[PDB]
Amino acid sequence: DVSFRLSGADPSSYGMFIKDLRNALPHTEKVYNIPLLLPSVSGAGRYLLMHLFNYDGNTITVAVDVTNVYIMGYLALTTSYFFNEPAADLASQYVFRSARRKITLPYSGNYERLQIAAGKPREKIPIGLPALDTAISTLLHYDSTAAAGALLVLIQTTAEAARFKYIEQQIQERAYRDEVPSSATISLENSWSGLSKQIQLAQGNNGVFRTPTVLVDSKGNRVQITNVTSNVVTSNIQLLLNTKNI
């Protein structure tokens, strides 16, 4: 399991949690020095449990698929909540079985679905460590509209940060003040599957992407990523979704 406490959290302790999260995901291979997530894992071992504590010390446990860093569901006191999707229903067979009751949330884990439930795109939702404290608090008591926004915060501040060092840095900058994600942050989240695929296809193509990935940069400019020498590949990306899952 991995854990993160909001009480006394700073850029350093958050960085430790994101390091722990990445290190908890198994890999047998690196591709261009980036860990390659497994094609699949059997049984309960497919799921990592993240123990998150809000500032008051209340806690949720979040179940994450170790093959793709997808959040499947979470446990809050004696109630489990899972996304309305086959993968999460499958997860519910393995985690939080001791919950007194299981609620299936009225949406899948998809960004598009979550944003419609929440009533806003994530361009408009501040993120940061204070937002993560709120999100844990919200998830503690069922409210499906509020939970969509909380889950948008949770997914980006955990999974997306694990995936991209840039996104981790954006959250560290937001340790004590929330701010909507940069255009670059949104771009990277949206491109993780694409990047993961092209980095793996580069392996037999002399480091060259079969298809260029379009991203927005730090100054908010649209750039073409064509090969593994790009900073996105050498510095930024920390985990590759296996092409078997693309």
Ligand SMILES: C[n+]1cn([C@@H]2O[C@H](COP(=O)(O)OP(=O)(O)O)[C@@H](O)[C@H]2O)c2nc(N)[nH]c(=O)c21
């Ligand atoms: C497509 N899929 C992607 N996610 C992740 O949760 C958010 C998925 O939403 P998305 O809109 O599919 O993401 P993307 O367009 O950025 O790939 C991203 O972090 C995805 O990595 C997903 N999470 C769950 N729980 N279930 C899914 O089927 C699923």
Ligand SMILES: *[C@@H]1O[C@H](CO)[C@@H](O)[C@H](O)[C@H]1NC(C)=O
């Ligand atoms: C590789 O990418 C760099 C910029 O990241 C660029 O200068 C170069 O033209 C690219 N090479 C190819 C063959 O795509």
